[PDB]
Amino acid sequence: AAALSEFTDQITGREGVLASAARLVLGQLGLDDPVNALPAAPDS
Amino acid sequence: AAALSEFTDQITGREGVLASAARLVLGQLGLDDPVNALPAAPDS
Amino acid sequence: AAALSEFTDQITGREGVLASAARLVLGQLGLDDPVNALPAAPDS
Amino acid sequence: LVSVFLEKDFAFVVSSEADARAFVEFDPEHTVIRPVPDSTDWQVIRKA
Asked: Which residues does chain B have within 8 Å of residue A39's beta carbon, measured at their own beta carbons?
């Protein structure tokens, strides 16, 4: 009774709903950048 | 012929679809923090 | 193999779709009131 | 000082019908009432 296949099925359908919305809703994600390592080297 | 009311209607329905998905899809947002102002003061 | 957790998961997602629609679709519910107990006392 | 204005859903507790009515005594011109028989109460939902 391995249910992990349908677990991944509902997760994949859920993430498909996410990817369906995300590009036409113009909710921009990934607008952040890891900056903190860049000034930490001249400080050191 | 002011169409801005139904423009805001489709934007509100779209954002409602967003808020419908966003909390049960467990796509965590707002996990970033503005850090860069904190080490910039002892550097100065 | 207790499946009741994911049963409640699909029920909660289903009711979330309900609550997503219900307030912007302007389908007003709960417009009824239990009235029948009120005139039954002066009749008695 | 706090002053926030709320336009949204009100999740509730199991109260009686009389306790729900006594709660919504001040309410009924600024709200919508919906009965819940599964919790044997009402639910107030207040506007802007």
From this structure: 36, 39-40, 43
Rg (CA), chain B: 19
**Is there a contact between D30 and D48 (Cβ–Cβ < 8 Å)?**
no
d(CA C22, CA D45): 13
A interface mutation test: which of B17, B31, B38 has the most A CBs within 10 A? B17
SS (H, E, C) chain D: CCCCCCCCCCCCCCCCHHHHHHHCCCCCCCEEEEEECCCCEEEEEECC
Q: Are D46 and D8 in contact (CB under 8 A)?
A: no
Entry resolution (Å): 3.3
- What is the Cα A8 distance to its own chain's centre? 17
The answer to whether C16 contacts B16, with C-beta atoms less than 8 Å apart, is no
Q: Which amino acid is at D14?
A: V
Which residues in A lie closer than 8 A to residue C6 (C-beta atoms)? 3, 7, 10
Method by which the coordinates were obtained: cryo-EM
